[PDB]
Structure formats: C-alpha cells, structure tokens
Amino acid sequence: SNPYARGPNPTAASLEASAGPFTVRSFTVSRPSGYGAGTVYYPTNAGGTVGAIAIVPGYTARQSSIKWWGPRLASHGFVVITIDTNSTLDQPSSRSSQQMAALRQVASLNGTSSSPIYGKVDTARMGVMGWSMGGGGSLISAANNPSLKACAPQAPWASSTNFSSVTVPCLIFACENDSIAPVNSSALPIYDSMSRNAKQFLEICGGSHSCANSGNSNQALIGKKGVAWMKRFMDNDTRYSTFACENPNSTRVCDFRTANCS
C-alpha cells in the first residue's frame, strides 16, 4: 500500500473540475521569512499529511498571477504557498532562494502548534512551480535541491537554458505565442536539455505569456495536468501515471512531448 495516497480514484472529469475532494482554507503568512509575502492554501480533511508546493510569480508580477493554483492544488491534497518576492524585479536565482525559503517556512509552520497547518505537512515531500522567471527559479531550485519530488514551471525563462543536471520530474507548460520567453528559445531548449528525468512539454495553442495564469481559459486541462504531475511524483501515486504521462489529445494543445514517463 502507498502511504502517501490521498483521496478517491481519479477520473478525467474529477481532475478537470474546479475543485478536488478536499475542503480548502487559507491564511496570509504574518511574518514572511526570506521572501516578501505569502498565502498558504491547505486542505482541512486530506486524511493524512500531504506534500508542500511553493509557487513564484514572474518579473513585475505578484501572487494574483499564480493564485488560482492555490485552491486548485490544495483541494487535491497539497499545502500550497504562493509568494510575492522581496522585490518585483528579483532575478531567477533570487526567486529560487525565496521559493526555498517559503518551503522552509511551511516546514516551520508545520511544527508550530498555533498554525492552521500544524501537523498537516510531510516536510520530506516538496514541489516547485512558477511563472516565467519564477519558472526559471523553480528549475534552479530543482537543480540545487534534488530531493524535491516535482517541478512544474509555466512559460519559463532563465539566463541559461541548460538544466542537464536536473533529476527531478519536470512538467513544462509552454504558451505558443509567448513573446516574452518564446517557446523556441526558452521552454523548448530547457526541456531538451534534461536527459536524466521524467519530463513533459505541454504547449497551449494560441497562448500568450500569461496562458497558465489566474483567469486562463484552459484551467480544465492545465489544472488536470498540474495536479496529475504533482500526485504522480510527490505522492508516488500510480493511480495518476496515465494522467501524468499521457498525450491529452486535446485541440487546446499545439505541441506535446514526454520522456521517461510510463
């Protein structure tokens, strides 16, 4: 039996829905430790400890850009922290440091009896996500901390596209018509550099740079894939192997690639 399996058996419908099975609550971090600000989303009734995911915005951007992931992932059995960086103009390495500081604080709060997330987190199972330079920061976090169980950046940008060292399972969401971090020069080269991990490349048809952000028109597919990836790799949950590894066969997807997945 898998000690990390949570919730009922998944379906395409249950993964495409607005919400998963668990009730979600949230709170603002009162004293952010090593980053600007944070919101923690958590399930109240997951039926066991769950992994934690830290999500970082892009250059100039704030939590509003990636907020939708908080309730979406938390409702399937994860503690999710969305952050604002110390400066909106922080670069990817700094974003990575702040992302890891946010994971550290979630672990701190797991051991703080006054916190709503006291005893709710398995601090040995963590994941990283983010938009643009925050996506680059997620890849840097994965390269520097290989015990991370999953990485799912969106429209990533980084100073170097070479992430050949990354052993962490990586799902790259890409936006076809991205003019800030073009697919051909950012997301795709990053994907191609990784030969030591489970990896996936999912490009959204007609998507601008913000195609996986809050308010996007593809929350059914993007949310299904993000949750499935985190479930498969953070929870070792093989009930999600097909959802995580499959080509969605969706008219919303203009390019799909996967390796070492199923």
Curated annotation (Swiss-Prot):
Temperature characteristics of this protein: Optimum temperature is 40 degrees Celsius for PET film hydrolysis. Optimum temperature is 30 degrees Celsius for PET (commercial drinking bottle) hydrolysis and BHET hydrolysis. Optimum temperature is 35-45 degrees Celsius for the hydrolysis of pNP-esters. Remains active even at 65 degrees Celsius (about 60% of maximum activity).
Effect of residue 213 to A: Displays decreased enzymatic activity on PET film and on BHET
Cell compartments where the protein resides: Secreted
Keywords: Disulfide bond, Hydrolase, Secreted, Serine esterase, Signal
Biotechnology: Has potential for application in environmental remediation and biological recycling of PET and PEF waste products.
Sites where the protein binds poly(ethylene terephthalate): 59, 133, 157
BP GO annotations: xenobiotic catabolic process
Gene3D superfamilies reported in the protein's UniProt record: alpha/beta hydrolase
pH dependence per the UniProt record: Optimum pH is 9 for PET film hydrolysis. Optimum pH is 9 for PET (commercial drinking bottle) hydrolysis. Optimum pH is 6.5-8.0 for BHET hydrolysis. Optimum pH is 8.0 for the hydrolysis of pNP-esters. The enzyme is active at pH 6-10, has an optimal pH range of 7-9 and it is rapidly inactivated below pH 7.0 or above pH 9.0.
SUPFAM superfamilies per UniProt: alpha/beta-Hydrolases
Mutagenesis / variant outcome for changing residue 213 to F: Increases activity towards 1-naphthyl butyrate
Pathway membership: Xenobiotic degradation
Enzyme Commission number: 3.1.1.101
Activity regulation behaviour: Salts and glycerol enhance the enzymatic activity in vitro towards pNP-esters, while detergents and organic solvents reduce the enzymatic activity.
Induction entry: Highly up-regulated during growth on PET film.
Disulfide bonds: 175-211, 245-261
Variant or mutagenesis effect after changing residue 59 to A: Displays increased enzymatic activity on PET bottle. Displays decreased enzymatic activity on PET film and on BHET
Pfam families found in the cross-reference section: PETase (PF12740)
Reaction(s) catalysed by this chain's protein: (ethylene terephthalate)(n) + H2O = (ethylene terephthalate)(n-1) + 4-[(2-hydroxyethoxy)carbonyl]benzoate + H(+); (2,5-ethylene furandicarboxylate)(n) + 2 H2O = (2,5-ethylene furandicarboxylate)(n-1) + 2,5-dicarboxyfuran + ethylene glycol + 2 H(+); an acetyl ester + H2O = an aliphatic alcohol + acetate + H(+); a butanoate ester + H2O = an aliphatic alcohol + butanoate + H(+)
Effect of residue 93 to E: Displays increased thermostability and increased PET degradation activity by 14-fold at 40 degrees Celsius
Family from the record: Belongs to the AB hydrolase superfamily.
Domain notes: PETase retains the ancestral alpha/beta-hydrolase fold but exhibits a more open active-site cleft than homologous cutinases.
Function noted in UniProt: Involved in the degradation and assimilation of the plastic poly(ethylene terephthalate) (PET), which allows I.sakaiensis to use PET as its major energy and carbon source for growth. Likely acts synergistically with MHETase to depolymerize PET. Catalyzes the hydrolysis of PET to produce mono(2-hydroxyethyl) terephthalate (MHET) as the major product. Also depolymerizes another semiaromatic polyester, poly(ethylene-2,5-furandicarboxylate) (PEF), which is an emerging, bioderived PET replacement with improved gas barrier properties.
Full protein name: Poly(ethylene terephthalate) hydrolase
Species per Swiss-Prot/TrEMBL record: Piscinibacter sakaiensis (Ideonella sakaiensis)
